[PDB]
UniProtKB/Swiss-Prot annotation, chain D:
The rodlike tail sequence is highly repetitive, showing cycles of a 28-residue repeat pattern composed of 4 heptapeptides, characteristic for alpha-helical coiled coils. Belongs to the TRAFAC class myosin-kinesin ATPase superfamily. Myosin family. The lineage of its organism: Eukaryota, Metazoa, Chordata, Craniata, Vertebrata. This is Myosin-11. It comes from the Eukaryota. It comes from Gallus gallus (Chicken).
Length: 50, 284, 148, 93, 251, 54, 49
């Protein structure tokens, strides 16, 4: 199911698949959680790719 | 120097034995049939023999030069590649035959003019002769088998195809077998090879510029790859030979002679350059 | 299976009981088939075991007479792997057409896809085929497990 | 920090979000500027760009105007020479 | 938290371009793949769509599209690449991953095989070697209690050894001294053994006698020891508790 | 070791009952000590709490 | 604003990381609006000291 850890893995693979750098851009008005969702993306990639 | 003690009939020293079997080796991966010589020296060579004070031979070096390894991929009309190739495609033992995936002649595209023969010379035996040499020289039993697969390799890599793609316009690997084999002889891997060979995961300057070449580029590489994988061999053997052959020295210089065919490529330029060079030496 | 081998099969089966009743725990079946030169996949073994359950897989036992009927059933199969394709799959992990894969990437795949192996299993396998740079040449490793 | 943390890269962007209090100082101007900036990126890559390639490859496709552009509101604060931008003036002035 | 303003969230979805952001995903073809990688990845699906001979990437792959009887609305053929519809490529991937599952998995098997036949044929080596070990021990367990064997044992050493040693004049003297020492040691050992035996007998007798009063006493002693240990533990715990309490009070 | 064991056995014989009695006495003493310790601990805790409040 | 960059090798492993910081509203370091605070660290220090 839709989850942040999913967007992170979807990209992190896409990169290694078609060999073409990627970006995860968190939009949303102030407060909407732009930050947290970033801390997760690192959180995930810090274990899933380390 | 002698261990004490008719034509070629004579038992030479231990090193002079090798000093003798060297030239017949470099002649393999290095000489090839041309419109001017059935067994042309495809690279200048300057042999150096070393003597002690008593006047005896003790050492020997060999400074190789301009190895026209270009022809390893495409040979002109009525010309051949480096002897060793044909020798292998033929002198190959049934067993080792497959061991290096050595399909018959004309099954490889690096051999233009298909299989051309050489007058008074039988490649069939030619093999053993050089095989025999290699041993005399010192190349370990297997140490050779290897130097042979690396040859087949330098040939298979020629079968590898890249047909244009009018959809994406980046020719692909419609067939595995080719590189499939090749990558086996290299002790490397397919998939990787393939990508690398098709999509250069390069890294220009301060960027991991990942890109994909065009059918052509796809080959100019697989081509100029094998082509250089070859030279990596010559230079190698030469230091294996030079590893055994090694106050005074005698110098013998065998440069490649003024040659001037149809296509007067770069090679022919430096070659006829040296020739002009040397002559002037005599003049001086 | 000619009695000649069937006679020996027993020698192998028998050579598999820690205590002595003359029974091979539903588990051992696999290795005993293997030891007899069989490469049954993990499923091909359970299928002819009535798909038991971990627990009962360590309780249930076997006697040659009831085992033999399985040895064969397996023995005769539809397919098998082969260099041809076997390596064709590993060559997909060959970072850069080098012809070799990192004994760490190989060590991964083998323990994260399909019939997942164990950390030790893979260790014991590749172990000693990694070079200075811990690089393994599949082509060979392939043949090793194979021709071996 | 960057001294320790340091072919491929993953990019994660955490810009400050559209914020608009009482005193809407300069800061709030560049901040809500970037926010307007970024959004437009999504608009480009989402509708503009995508349809161009449909054209390029020449597939059976007709354009569709999603009416999503803020270029204007960027010029009013981005553009320099020619019709100056809010930033422009405040720079020379 | 748990509070969700309808319109506030309705506008966001407005100024952010969500809906439109979705129309094209449904409207257009957000997935595209070039003619080569396509006839590459999913050829395994149509092994006989493309003839043995070569063929133009495009056309050659349009064949295998008919081979999957793909609906002419899911895809869109272009110039160099094909433009597919959402999900259309996912399913194509699934299939292929199925078409190869068995094979995968395949290798792992042979490994368990190889990895097996070998480590079994290993326990086989420790085995005659086992037997050897097996039987060999058993002997000893039987023998070690046999007069004759103990005899051989004490005696096994005197074997070889002399006359020369004795003569040596220095060596001979040393040997003599050593012999004397050995004899003394042996005597001492014998005496010790006898004493030990006597002690053991006495102990046994005492134990029997104790078994009833003695037994009771032993039990009591054990109980007392246990109690003491418990008490000590309790005391320690109490002390710790007191300290903690004091700290808490101060805080 | 044997001698030590023998001595212990002899004492017990003079012995198991005697040992048991001794053990019981020890246990009782230990229990008393434990109780005292517990009481002290409780008092300390109370004091600490008061101090903290203050 | 902040833009973190993570770097991977060919095998797919994390190896590096950069951080491009932007518009640091350090104004508030001197005067904070109503019901607002300064940069956390300040208070942290005045207390965790």
């Amino acid at each position: 199911p839709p989850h942040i850890y999913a967007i992170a893995d979807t990209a992190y693979r896409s990169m290694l698949q078609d060999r073409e750098d990627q970006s995860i851009l968190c939009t949303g008005e102030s407060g909407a959680g732009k930050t947290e969702n970033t801390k997760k993306v690192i959180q995930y990639l810090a274990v899933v790719a380390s | 120097s002698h261990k004490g003690k008719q034509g070629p009939s004579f038992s030479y020293g231990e090193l002079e034995k090798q000093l003798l079997q060297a030239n017949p080796i470099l002649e393999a991966f290095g000489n090839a049939k041309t419109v001017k010589n059935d067994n042309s020296s495809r690279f200048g060579k300057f042999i150096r023999i070393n003597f002690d004070v008593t006047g005896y031979i003790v050492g020997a070096n060999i400074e190789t030069y301009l190895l026209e390894k270009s022809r390893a991929i495409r040979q002109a009309k009525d010309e051949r590649t480096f002897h060793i190739f044909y020798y292998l495609i033929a002198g190959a033992s049934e067993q080792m035959r497959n061991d290096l995936l050595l399909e018959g002649f004309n099954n490889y595209t690096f051999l233009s003019n298909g299989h051309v023969p050489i007058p008074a010379q039988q490649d069939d035996e030619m093999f053993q002769e050089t095989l025999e040499a290699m041993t005399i020289m010192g190349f370990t039993e297997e140490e050779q088998t290897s130097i042979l697969r690396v040859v087949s390799s330098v040939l298979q890599l020629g079968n590898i195809v890249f047909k244009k793609e009018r959809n994406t316009d980046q020719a692909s690997m419609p067939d595995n077998t080719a590189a499939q084999k090749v990558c086996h002889l290299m002790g490397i891997n397919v998939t990787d090879f393939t990508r690398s060979i098709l999509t250069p995961r390069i890294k220009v300057g301060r960027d991991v510029v990942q890109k994909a070449q065009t059918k052509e580029q796809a080959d100019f590489a697989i081509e100029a790859l094998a082509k250089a994988k070859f030279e990596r061999l010559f230079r190698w053997i030469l230091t294996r030979v030079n590893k055994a052959l090694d106050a005074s020295f005698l110098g013998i210089l065998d440069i490649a002679g003024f040659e001037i065919f149809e296509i007067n490529s770069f090679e022919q330029l430096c070659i006829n350059y040296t020739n002009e060079k040397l002559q002037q030496l005599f003049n001086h | 299976f000619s009695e000649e081998q069937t006679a020996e099969f027993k020698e192998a089966f028998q050579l598999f009981d820690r205590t002595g009743d003359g029974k091979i725990l539903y588990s051992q079946c696999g290795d005993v088939m293997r030891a007899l030169g069989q490469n049954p996949t993990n499923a091909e073994v359970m299928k002819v075991l009535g798909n038991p359950k971990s627990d009962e897989m360590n309780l249930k036992t076997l006697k040659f007479e009831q085992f033999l009927p399985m040895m064969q059933t397996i023995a005769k199969n539809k397919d098998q792997g082969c260099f041809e394709d076997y390596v064709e799959g590993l060559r997909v992990f060959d970072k850069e057409g080098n012809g070799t894969v990192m004994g760490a990437e190989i060590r991964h795949v083998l323990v994260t896809l399909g019939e997942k192996m164990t950390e030790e299993e893979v260790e014991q396998l590749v172990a000693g085929h990694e070079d200075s740079n811990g690089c393994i040449n599949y082509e060979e490793l392939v043949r090793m497990v194979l021709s071996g | 920090v960057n001294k320790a943390l340091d072919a491929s890269f993953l990019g994660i962007l955490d810009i400050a979000g559209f914020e608009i209090f009482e005193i809407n100082s300069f800061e709030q101007l560049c901040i809500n500027y970037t926010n307007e900036k970024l959004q437009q990126l999504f608009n480009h890559t989402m509708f503009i760009l995508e349809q161009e390639e449909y054209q390029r490859e020449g597939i059976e496709w007709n354009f569709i105007d999603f009416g999503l552009d803020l270029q204007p509101c960027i010029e009013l604060i981005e553009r320099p020479t020619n019709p100056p931008g809010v930033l422009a003036l405040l720079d020379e002035e | 938290a748990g509070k969700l303003d309808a319109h506030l969230v309705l506008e966001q979805l407005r100024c952010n371009g969500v809906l439109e952001g979705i129309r094209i995903c449904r409207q257009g073809f957000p997935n595209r793949i070039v003619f080569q990688e396509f006839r590459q990845r999913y050829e395994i699906l149509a092994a006989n769509a493309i003839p043995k001979g070569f063929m133009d990437g495009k056309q050659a792959c349009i064949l295998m599209i008919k081979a999957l009887e793909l609906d002419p609305n899911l895809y869109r053929i272009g110039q160099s690449k094909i433009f597919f519809r959402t999900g259309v490529l996912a399913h194509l991937e699934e299939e292929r991953d199925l078409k190869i599952t068995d094979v995968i998995i395949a290798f792992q098997a042979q490994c368990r095989g190889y990895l097996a036949r070998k480590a079994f044929a290993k326990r086989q080596q420790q085995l005659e070697s086992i037997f050897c070990i097996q039987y060999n021990v058993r002997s000893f367990m039987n023998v070690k209690h046999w007069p004759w064997m103990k005899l051989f044992f004490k005696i096994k050493p005197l074997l070889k050894v002399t006359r020369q040693e004795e003569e040596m004049q220095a060596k001979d003297e040393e040997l003599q001294r050593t012999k004397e020492r050995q004899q003394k040691a042996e005597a001492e050992l014998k005496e010790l053994e006898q004493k030990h035996t006597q002690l053991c007998e006495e102990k046994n007798l005492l134990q029997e006698k104790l078994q009833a009063e003695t037994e009771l006493y032993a039990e009591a002693e054990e109980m007392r020891v246990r109690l003491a240990a418990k008490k000590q533990e309790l005391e320690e715990i109490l002390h710790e508790m007191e300290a903690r309490i004091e700290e808490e009070e101060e805080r």
